[PDB]
């Protein structure tokens, strides 16, 4: 049947649907190479598949919202990993060994009073 | 390579080369090449004399070079003898468009003059 995974990264969240196939990937009704023009983003998306050796045994249906290129690419990689574990449960050990199961919780630090940014202070002068 | 009395560069695109004329910016240079029927990316070197002349008349439609240089000089002249506040700023070399003079204003004043 269909297998599902929810992935999140920065302000992005990806819905992933995994089913046996031949290796075709759709992201927001576009192809992988059409959606992600950045070469790093394409490698991030694939990374779980090159690891478990199920690259061309599956079909990927994926919708994403929010964030940017690297966030969505990373968000898909997380939800993909959560889909494969709903597929086979013996993959958790090798996926976690690759750092793919962890939800990356790094977010933008808020701007604070008296600072120019989250941490950049205004220029100081003794006199 | 001789328009409006000056010589224009020969190794530059026609749209860039025409901007050497006092009174012709990038917009006017774009209109003239359109009014003459010449592309913008063509170097004026490979422009036939039968085309340069078709640029010279169009440039004549604009007040350029010495005629413009005399109009601008006359406009300022009219403010200075008038005694209006703008002409007093031209007399004293200060900025005329209400900028601060406590600091800055070095374009109108020039480099600093120590006490």
């Amino acid at each position: 049947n269909q297998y599902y995974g929810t992935g999140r990264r920065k302000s992005s969240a990806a819905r992933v649907f995994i089913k046996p196939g031949n290796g075709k990937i759709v992201i927001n009704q576009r192809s992988l190479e059409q959606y992600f023009g950045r070469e790093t983003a394409r490698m991030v998306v694939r990374q779980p598949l090159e690891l478990v050796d199920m690259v061309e045994k599956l079909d990927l249906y994926i919708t994403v919202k929010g964030g940017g290129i690297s966030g969505q690419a990373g968000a898909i990689r997380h939800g993909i990993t959560r889909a494969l574990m709903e597929y086979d449960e013996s993959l958790r050990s090798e996926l976690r060994k690759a750092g793919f199961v962890t939800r990356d919780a790094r977010q933008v630090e808020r701007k604070k009073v008296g600072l120019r940014k989250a941490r950049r202070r205004p220029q100081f002068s003794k006199r | 390579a001789r328009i409006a009395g000056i010589n224009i560069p020969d190794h530059k695109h026609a749209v860039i080369a025409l901007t050497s004329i006092y009174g012709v910016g990038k917009t006017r240079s774009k209109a003239i090449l359109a009014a003459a029927g010449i592309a913008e990316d063509v170097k004026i070197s490979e422009l036939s004399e039968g085309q340069i002349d078709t640029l010279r008349d169009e440039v004549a439609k604009f007040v350029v070079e010495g005629d413009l240089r005399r109009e601008i000089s006359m406009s300022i002249k009219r403010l200075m003898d008038l005694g209006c506040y703008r002409g007093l700023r031209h007399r004293r070399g200060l900025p005329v468009r209400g900028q601060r003079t406590k600091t800055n204003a070095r374009t109108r004043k020039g480099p600093r003059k120590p006490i």
Partner: protein, 153 residues
């Protein structure tokens, strides 16, 4: 830091070649967080370097590193009286970090057209012990040579 609580950060391997070594070199070259702009510059210079020699992009890159990596450097050491520039052994990781930084710094100083070409001419001279970066490695080895007497402070 005082408390020594600083571990290590994982760096992704570069896309085209899967070399973490090369991915750090893109990072040293990157400005303003524009990583893709730096990825392209490195790839173009690497291909000009791959066809200027017979080796692959990596083997030509390593040969450039081997001629720029310093082995010994000098660090100051204020002790009871004054400060001597003590020669210290450069740890294997810092060897690569210094080699890359000097290459990128030397290439930025050249006067060719693009940065991809400048980086290519520096990576090529580094294969022949010419240009800056390689010279910077020579100036460091000389300083550490003239201070070998202070090799116990």
């Amino acid at each position: 830091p005082r408390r020594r609580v600083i571990g290590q950060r994982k760096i992704l391997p570069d896309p085209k070649f899967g070399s973490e070594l090369l991915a750090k070199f893109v990072n040293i070259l990157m400005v303003d967080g524009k990583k893709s702009t730096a990825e392209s510059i490195v790839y173009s210079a690497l291909e000009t370097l791959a066809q200027r020699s017979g080796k692959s992009e990596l083997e030509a890159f390593e040969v450039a590193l081997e001629n720029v990596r310093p082995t010994v450097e000098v660090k100051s050491r204020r002790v009871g009286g004054s400060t001597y520039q003590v020669p210290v052994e450069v740890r294997p990781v810092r060897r690569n970090a210094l080699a890359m930084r000097w290459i990128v710094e030397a290439a930025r100083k050249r006067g060719d057209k693009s940065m991809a070409l400048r980086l290519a001419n520096e990576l090529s001279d580094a294969a022949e012990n010419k240009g800056t970066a390689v010279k910077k490695r020579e100036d460091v080895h000389r300083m550490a040579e003239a201070n070998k007497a202070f090799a116990h402070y």
